Symmetry: C2
Subunit: 363 residues, 2 copies
């Protein structure tokens, strides 16, 4: 059955730690069914309100003007109808992020209406996936690692790109503290230039990392990346800052990044990321999503990972290691964490319906 | 005399007509001196608040933490220090715009301190410039053209791209009305694909247009612009949606566009646009800016055009044809409009200081 959006809304939340912002969107069909989704908005710090405004004043009008055979058709329609606007305003990101969020909501709506958990609706056959503690801070990792390993995590990702000396210390130390079986990862957030990247890569090798994330700016020429891949001892990862089928297609063909990390709440949602995840896995590469926002986006990625678990190189879902009620409050699956894994269950859709009253009461 | 920003505030205004938005910025010197600027924000309709937030939460701190030899240096610092944030968020536009507005204010501040009108500061030798009624709607062109002619306008630009047949009717009709010596332009706002532009550029030929603006999306590969440029009877114009030094060099390298129109409030400000505007005129091409925002940005554009008069063909500053107090209450140069031309006078800086209190009241 087709989807006829009748009411579309965006809700902004901000939990103070600076705070953790969140943009939740809800789509209501004319017949009453409802779907929920999240819009990436960690940066800038003030972008949450703008993204929510985009959803209500730009996208919503387009969504409630007709019907759509399914989420994918609505995605293409919203992309096509804002292409020029994106060029006029220079806001490819905000528009992509608002559209991604809306796509998760529509898929949630569709799946909830079909009576299937999102992972099944997406073609998956299992609901259990592994995870990893993402974003561990450079202060003293081994400390936060232990807490998480206690919570049930069996994979961790340290943050480097600050002080070459310190970072290398944390990597090797945590490696020793964990053992040799535990997968360990590092994220530099586009913090290095080619020269420094080549060096840190080499220096990190002993840490036996599963991958080195964004060692360079996504901006850098493909050629610089190619050179770093060859030179580096571990596989490179990126995707958080890649958007569009063409962009992912180019990175995929280059094979400089052996771990692709598309963020469904930042671009494409399910309609866009499902096919790129499939392209990555089929190319022999590794698909490992991550979401550092509220629970809805996390649940969403969990369902997608379940639908595309990888073959020879299974994938893990990155869960923000930093405290944040906006995640644990809207991500029931995290309660199943046991032995580095979680199970999504069979609740139709995302498996979570935000309690708005309760969310603002936590803010 | 170096610049040492101390306080940077952004004020948003929305004049109900849905409504005309505006974001004015004021940078206060360490000596108490003040400079004013404008940050482009026509689209999306909800984008004004976000841009003002960017100025106060992201650019202000960078700006007020050090000193700068001149505005150009502060400009280069702001771009470099936000390059990565642009990637992470996909907001190259909002950031460029906020940056451009702040450059306009730093230059305004510098010109005032030197006791000079911005045009003189930019190294200009005259203050008299031509203008054109810009953005006449397709419904009844002959009517508003008559009205604007009565107001003092001796050049006009029509909006096209909606309906092929009606557009060529309007184009030719308005040409008849105006006679022949009167400059006539047309703006398609990236509304056509290559084969349609070729077709229309041909059918418009008899209107004897001075230039066809944005016939294709700014996105299109050089090959499509190169082809259209050859097939078109009139020259092509663009710039509204070209940002960055590298993008203009590319446009310049091809010369498909013979009329370059950088929007100093959208990108680069004076620090960025003066060089490209001078480069355009020296390369034997026309530099015809236009500002459809509020008065501050328009005055800023008039000054730049005065500083870069033109050699081959006299540059023309485009003024919004529709009513907007946000523009009229802040652009006194218009009160000198006589025989399709205005003069900036010797008043320091932009030649105007906004009356926030008054403006809010008018809203």
């Amino acid at each position: 059955a087709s989807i006829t959006p009748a009411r579309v809304r965006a809700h902004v939340f901000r939990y103070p730690v600076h705070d953790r912002p969140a943009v939740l969107v809800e789509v209501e069909d004319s017949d009453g069914a409802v779907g929920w989704g999240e819009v990436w908005c960690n940066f800038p710090a003030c972008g949450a309100e703008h993204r929510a405004r985009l959803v209500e004043t730009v996208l919503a009008p387009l969504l409630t003007a007709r019907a759509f055979a399914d989420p994918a058709q609505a995605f293409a329609h919203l992309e096509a109808r804002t292409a020029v606007l994106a060029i006029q305003t220079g806001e490819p990101g905000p528009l992509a992020q608002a559209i991604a969020g809306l796509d998760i909501a529509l898929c949630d709506l569709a799946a909830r209406r079909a009576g299937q958990p999102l992972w099944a609706w997406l073609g998956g056959s299992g609901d259990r996936i592994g995870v990893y503690a993402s974003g561990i801070n450079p202060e003293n990792p081994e400390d936060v690692v232990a807490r998480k390993a206690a919570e049930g995590y069996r994979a961790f990702k340290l943050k480097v790109g600050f002080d070459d000396a310190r970072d290398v210390r944390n990597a090797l130390h945590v490696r020793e503290l964990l053992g040799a079986a535990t997968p360990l990862m590092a994220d530099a957030n586009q913090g290095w230039d080619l020269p420094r990247a080549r060096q840190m890569a080499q220096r990190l090798g002993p840490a036996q990392l599963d991958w080195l994330e964004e060692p360079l700016r996504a901006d850098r020429p493909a050629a610089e990346w190619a050179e770093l891949a060859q030179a580096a001892p571990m596989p490179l990862a990126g995707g958080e800052n890649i958007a569009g089928v063409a962009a992912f297609e180019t990175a995929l063909a280059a094979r400089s990044l052996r771990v692709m990390q598309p963020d469904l709440a930042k671009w494409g949602g399910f309609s866009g990321c499902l096919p790129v995840a499939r392209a990555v896995v089929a190319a022999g590469l590794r698909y490992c999503p991550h979401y550092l926002g509220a629970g809805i986006g996390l649940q969403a990625s969990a369902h997608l990972l379940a639908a595309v678990p990888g073959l020879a190189s299974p994938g893990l879902l990155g869960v923000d290691a930093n405290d944040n009620p906006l995640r644990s409050l809207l991500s029931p699956a995290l309660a199943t964490l046991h032995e580095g894994r979680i199970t999504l269950g069979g609740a139709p859709g995302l498996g979570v319906t935000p309690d708005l009253a309760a969310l603002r009461a936590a803010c």
